[PDB]
């Protein structure tokens, strides 16, 4: 079979639509998500046209093998989509209405800069390669674009599923390619991060500051070193849920900065002890009293500065 | 092949039934479960009708290829089900009896609010898309819905497997869709959580309270900080067996609240020491004596309040 | 094709046999094992009968497509077995000899009560559904049932591979089903558990008891708390190699009971200190001296009681 | 079908080109990467030649089955590539233009010596086996070799994608093989390693050195031992992201060397205590004062030496 | 198609050869390795013989479907190999030369007794089942057995790839089977184990022995208990990279024995303290002084004994 013939020199328009059924498995480390959707295609083939009076029928059904079907592929998929044809229906003028249900693992990159308070735009790129007979261009049939109400992406809120109606038409290996951009806008459910990582991490930091109300070096060393180890465990736990980024993430910045607070607390604890031993407890008292205000104030201001730079 | 013709303008009723053989791999993090069952279908095709006297046979067997079979799909499956046809049998009036054995990874969401004392309703949604010739509606043949006695879901108790007999009929891409709801009611086997997480977590908390019968700051700091680290390990262990929820789980609440008890214990230990050093051990004694009663009482009441809110 | 016709009213007997080649991947958490075996089938089809004088050949070979083959399935498999036909040989009377080599992930439950000193009976269930023409019954050809000598299941000892010769004939969805039980008896290689978990766990417990020969509260607190944390790590390590059971396992019981010994050791250490501070070291000495005998004796007796209840 | 016949005794030249679409999943432990690209092939088959005047058409399209296609394979792939034919176009002289889209898991080894400041050359080897009729030789059509601008390899910077134009022609299993080398030059994004591993590891080391300004043995023992354990955690974390190499990696060397600094710090702390107890605090003071300069200076010089040897 | 006919009563000899292209993924826990190789087969079929003068051609190429091909299988593979036919060439006398490229996950057991200083012999077993027409026997064509120079197995050194030329001919299910043994001899690259596990483990042990130069019970308790916990972490890390063996491994023995050294160090530290408290520091001094020599000497001798028993 060959592609439909042109009336003039016009390209063949394949109208498209994606309707998401199931959306799942958003892997932050891999920057992939799995999709299960309907893919609808529509184009005119005059060779398939018929008289509804003479033929009796209003529409004719065909098996994929019987007629010409455009070779539509996804750009950013990992492997070729798993698809099963639902229906192929031809109207009297020759307008073909194709429907298939597919599943694919889509590879769309993520911006972790504001993690875990980030929003993403996942992409699904549809493409078509022009044949030698005639050039093929993609279009968006907006009535055949949508998502099921049940569509749930665990740990995420689905905001919108829309399509950029104008295709990106370009040359590739000396043939025209027509690319379409389907955008799924989502925003992370940050709630769990608060009682599981953020508040536990702040509690251990504040426990380290109880050393500013203690003269016992042995006890202070235990307080600041033990809590520093718990902070290392939280840093490790966090960096496992995320990929290695060439930029600083919001959580990454706070986690990093907190190390400096532990380091300065060890210095203060060491200075206090050295002074007490050197028979200068009055000077050590001044430093300890100042630290009680300095540490919380500097922590609070540094956090205002960070939140400002990131949001 | 085309769908059976209507006697009048009535839709075609496809009677369904699911009989579970093997039920396994309930992933809490992924909110998926694997199923291995029989899918039975039954509809009338008058074109297949025959006289049992003339034909000799009481029933005729056909290969899927030979006759029209409705395109039945699962909504909430991850990928398309793995199915193998067991039998296709036609009675003299034209009643077709289809049977296939399938396996699928079903995606049904879970409510972790009462975890690990939770009960779930897993769903299996059967659907059918109407063709242009005629509208197709699903039905439940209750005699062909069940489960094997051996059916075991590790760490869960299987309560019931029933079907919501009235389908959810709706329009999708300007064609009628008939959806059916098969519900598998299960309840978690919480037993293991008690000697592995709950009791170990309470033991370490009670060990931290032995600091209220000690005047040694160095020993108290060690007692409260060491046990806090073991609590962090239990929080991490628990949050690995579960997905990130936009709500508070029962275990999540208890785990979180216990951090506050550790934080207040550090404050008491710090106050006691500061007072002893300031030559006020009588005042420190009053606070320590009070804490011995306050901590267990507040812990017990706070837990009554939590159990009340969650159950 | 249709099933062979009966000489009288007798059912069709399909003789079976399983010969294990490779046995591997016993997942305790999943209660699955992988198998690679030969499945042999034999039945008589008079329609295939031939004269060896006229045909030249003594036996005729056929492709599965060419003749009727019974639809034999496994009950407790995860997905449908991967099978490849080795041979199909027909003798002049019409006796078909089918041979295939398959691989499958079998789902057979396990009893962890005596873990890691447990023995299991893995099951492989073969089944056949009767057709409308005639009822099909399974049989065991004992000469075609066995296992290779090289068959090794990592961390397990293979005791026997036998078949329950009488099939379970029952009704399912108004058709006769003939089920056969192939049993693989295995016993765990507990050896590694002793130097890796049991002895390390006992060493840390005995180290905690060196606190009964020490008057230093600060040192005792460190001894009992540090070793308790190592016990938590062993509890976590053990519960990762096992699924969540609605019963107590042998190792589970010992691990749990050892927490009580740590809890009572913390109480003794606290009492000793309180008494020494209260200027009653004589009474504290009596308690400490008693604990030196009490702790090992109670530990030894409690273990005799547990081993008795479990074995 | 047979291969094209030679005009004379010349070999058949198959012109090749790889255009990367998606590049992903670089596993450092496995030394694999996944690729999704276009494979373009071109060769002359005089048997396919036609007159454009007589035939009407300028090019003829064929199904893979209709004509002879060279059996092109990848050497260093894990399993055989997943490929789907995009187009096959024949020009009047008989020049065939083949295009397929494929995906494969490529196995190319990595040099971790300068990790995480390393650069790699990933290889994709195309090969062809000569037939008895005639020898087949590969070539590079440079206009059909490239990569998409969107091509992103997480945690890596893609420098270049080029081909070694002259094939490696050699004998294998008594037939000529023509191998081509496609090279993807990449360099690691080391940025994340600095705030997550390098700086945290240096902070804990510097904290251990605060023991040179402390006379408290109990506090020093806690400082040096606790920080050594955090260093062990970083060593374990690092060796999980990497395979077992028969050489020393850059990070491996630094991590190893830091153990020696911890060991010498324990010796100093032990010596200081022994001397103070032996009533020689003046000598212990000299050693402690010297260590304050020695440790940072030796650490800084040893690091200059290492960076020099590795870069 | 039927197998070639015998000239007399001789069996049919199928000459074999395996040439490794890529060798990868040696899983110690699973006792599996993945292979990507060429499988060459050669046998004589007189029915395929032709006169090179009359036919013009020197060799005839055939599609697998056209001629009889022996059913060759691998014994110790996990699932059936993935294979693709490269070439089939028939010489004038009827000698068939078959070539296919395959990939398989091979299950060959490992001996961890000398781990990580162990050497292994991986096996690839080729087998053939005799048909009723005639018995089939395997042979090794040594010129068609080999491996690529690039063949690299990460963390291993590939020593040799040879075949045991005499097949194992035996009866199985009343038919002859011809098994061949292909042996891949490899030896572990132990280098990484030294700076990552062995030396870190020895450093922490030697740190525990600094307690023999300290009179501070509180410091000693911290030194010996903290280092014991780091030893537990190394034991856990090691037992994760290995399966559960019914024998003692070399590393397993050293790791186990080191626990006894920690246990005796706790006893010495406890004895020293009890004696100092009992006002017997002179006796405690004798024990401590002796331990300084005893511990290193006994450690060194015990290790000589172990290395002797294992190597
Ligand atoms: C002279 C003291 C020898 C101690 C030997 C202890 C051997 C224990 C063997 C356990 C085998 C399983 C059960 C733990 C006992 C801890 C020993 C504490 C020793 C205190 C010594 C006091 C100095 C007089
Ligand atoms: C505690 C410290 C444990 C150190 C263990 C030493 C290694 C050993 O003794 O290992 C033994 C292996 C033997 O190698 P083989 O070829 O299998 O000898 C087989 C000999 N037969 C056939 C005669 C029996 O020697 C090595 O690899 C030596 C280099 C490693 C040194 C690592 C030191 C750290
Ligand atoms: Cl696609
Ligand atoms: Cl489905
Ligand atoms: Cl509606
Ligand atoms: Cl409709
Ligand atoms: Cl099966
Ligand atoms: Cl390939
Ligand atoms: Cl195989
Ligand atoms: Na088509
Ligand atoms: Na059909
Ligand atoms: Na059949
Ligand atoms: Na071809
Ligand atoms: Na064949
Ligand atoms: Na301590």
Residue numbers in the entry:
A (entry chain E), B (entry chain A), C (entry chain B), D (entry chain D), E (entry chain C): 5 to 315
How do the authors describe this structure?
The mutant of the vestibular pair on the β5 strand, D86N-D88N, yields a significant decrease in pH50 greater than 1 pH unit. All residues were also tested individually, with most mutations having no significant effect, although a large majority tend to decrease the pH50 (notably D86N/A, D88N/A, and D91N). Mutation of Asp/Glu residues at the complementary (−) face, in general, decreased the proton sensitivity of the GLIC, with additive effects in many cases, especially for D88 and D86. However, the pattern of phenotypes does not allow discriminating whether those residues are involved in proton sensing or gating, because mutations to Asn/Gln also produced decreased proton sensitivity. A structural analysis was performed on E26Q, E26A, E35Q, E35A, E67A, E75A, E82Q, E82A, D86A, D88N, D88A, H127N, E181A, and H277Q mutants, by solving their structure at pH 4. The key mutants at E26, D86, and D88 were solved at pH 4, each showing a structure similar to that of the Wt. All structures were in the apparently open conformation.
